[PDB]
Amino acid sequence: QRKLPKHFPVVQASDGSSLLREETIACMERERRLPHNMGKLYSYHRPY
């Protein structure tokens, strides 16, 4: 039985400890803000 719903994104270490769950959450949020793999955007509202 699932301890968390299927739509919850897994943010945890490979062992199962949540010591840096907020650190990983902040890393994912920074990735969502500006992904390092972001290519050449096409929008007219470019960041620069």
Partner 1 sequence: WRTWEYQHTRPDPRPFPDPPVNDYFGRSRIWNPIACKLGYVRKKADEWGWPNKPPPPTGLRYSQEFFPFFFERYFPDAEVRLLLDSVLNNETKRPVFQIPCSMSKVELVNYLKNIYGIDNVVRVEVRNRRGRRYKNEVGEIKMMDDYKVAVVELDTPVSVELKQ
Partner 2 sequence: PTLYLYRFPGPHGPGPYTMKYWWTLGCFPTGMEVPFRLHEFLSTYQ
- CB 46 within 8 Å of CB 34: no
Among residues 15, 45, 47, 48, the one that binds partner 2 under rule CB under 8 A: 45
Q: Is residue 48 within the footprint of partner 2 (CB under 8 A)?
A: no
Place of tokens 């968390």: 4
Q: Is residue 29 within the footprint of RNA (CB under 7 A)?
A: yes
For partner 1, the binding residues in 1-48 under the rule CB under 8 A are 18-19, 21-23, 30, 32-34, 41-43, 45-48
Q: How far apart are CA 15 and CA 19, in angstroms?
A: 11
| DSSP secondary structure code for residue 10 in this structure | P
Residues that bind partner 2 (CB under 8 A): 39-40, 42-45
